[PDB]
């Protein structure tokens, strides 16, 4: 499977991005989990039971979807959870969703990471990072002669990624050869690009998981 796609500027700016893809338990006072506020979100700092894991954020209380660090009711989540008269309470946790800005940051972070990997290379004539691996995902990167990066995240077993990258390059090429003087720091909004990229993803989704 394919998790997501990132198209980065030569300057580290995100000009295109696409994603290709929840526990609820009743608690008494006090809670079995340690919660902390992190970047306008309430996450689980410690404790792991019945589906809930450390990095999970509070998504809803008593069936009510939470609003960042506040309650659907306007009250501060951690304050509400600090009052024993509000128990029992039903809470829903899940891997938080990346914000647009977070995506911008990560894309910029990867930009410098890529360069360093090249700079700190023990062998000459080395490119930046082409493949970064994890236990849950693999990141594949292709850099154009003009410095544009096509980043694809997928299941560690997913194959036929070389063709996907090569295909995205073609699709991008059509957008470049059609928009010769288009701003480099501006996002790729062309519907043909989006649509063609979509299809390449469908194809790749069938290259098997070997």
């Amino acid at each position: 499977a394919i998790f997501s796609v990132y198209v980065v500027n030569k300057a580290g700016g995100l000009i295109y991005q696409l994603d290709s893809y929840e526990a609820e338990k009743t608690f008494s006072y006090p809670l079995d989990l340690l919660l902390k506020l992190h970047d306008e979100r309430v996450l689980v700092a410690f404790g792991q039971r019945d589906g809930i894991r450390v990095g999970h954020a509070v998504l809803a209380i008593n069936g009510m979807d939470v609003n960042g660090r506040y309650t659907a009711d306007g009250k501060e989540v951690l304050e509400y959870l600090g009052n024993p008269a509000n128990y029992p309470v039903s809470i829903r946790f899940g891997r938080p969703r990346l914000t647009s800005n977070e995506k911008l940051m990560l894309a910029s972070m990867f930009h410098s990471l890529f360069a360093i990997g090249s700079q700190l290379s023990p062998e000459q004539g080395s490119s930046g990072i082409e493949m970064l691996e994890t236990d849950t995902f693999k990141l594949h990167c292709y850099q154009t002669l003009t410095g544009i990066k096509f980043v694809v995240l997928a299941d560690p077993r997913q194959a036929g990624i070389d063709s996907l990258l090569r295909k995205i390059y073609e699709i991008y090429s059509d957008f470049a050869l059609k928009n010769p003087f288009y701003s480099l720091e501006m996002p790729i909004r062309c519907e043909l690009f989006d649509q063609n990229l979509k299809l390449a993803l469908e194809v790749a989704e069938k290259a098997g998981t070997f």
Binding site: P30, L31, D32, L33, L34, G47, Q48, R49, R53
Partner: protein
């Protein structure tokens, strides 16, 4: 079987009790010495058992009782008395591991206080601030030996 460690520990205690006029101080040095052992021992433990970082005081208690105590003391303590918050539990031992044979016997001295330093020192090296404390000792009339384990906070990456 290790009477060496137990006998050696007995000599340490004996010595310190002579060095210090007040037992409260012996408890302090034993815990500190334990701590110095714990921050080192954690490495030996991880390299031999291959356990990963924990994220729940309950899994941490299992590793401690069923894997660590077994490996270094040839025993498997019992886990009991979980506080509702889950940030507190106890280690119940049939007897007292650091003890060999002692003379009998009102003393403020916590004979096996070294253990506590080991537990807090080791756990600290894995991002967990905990207080280890003796609340029941077979050396003092109690039925069993009980160590209370309290989670204070998770240390953050620098």
């Amino acid at each position: 079987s290790s009477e060496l460690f137990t006998l050696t520990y007995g000599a340490l205690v004996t010595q310190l009790c002579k060095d210090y006029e007040n037992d409260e101080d012996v408890n302090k040095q034993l815990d500190r010495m334990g701590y110095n052992i714990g921050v080192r021992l954690i490495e030996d433990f991880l390299a031999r058992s291959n356990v990963g970082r924990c994220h729940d005081f309950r899994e941490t208690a299992d590793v401690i009782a069923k894997v660590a105590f077994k490996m270094y003391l040839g025993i498997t303590p019992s886990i009991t008395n979980w506080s509702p918050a889950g940030d507190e539990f106890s280690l119940i031992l049939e007897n007292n591991p650091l003890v060999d044979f002692v003379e009998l016997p009102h003393s403020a001295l916590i004979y096996s206080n070294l253990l506590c330093g080991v537990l807090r020192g080791a756990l600290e090296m894995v991002q967990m601030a905990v207080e280890a404390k003796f609340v029941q000792d077979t050396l003092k009339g109690d039925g069993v030996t009980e160590i209370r384990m309290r989670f204070i906070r998770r240390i953050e990456d620098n």
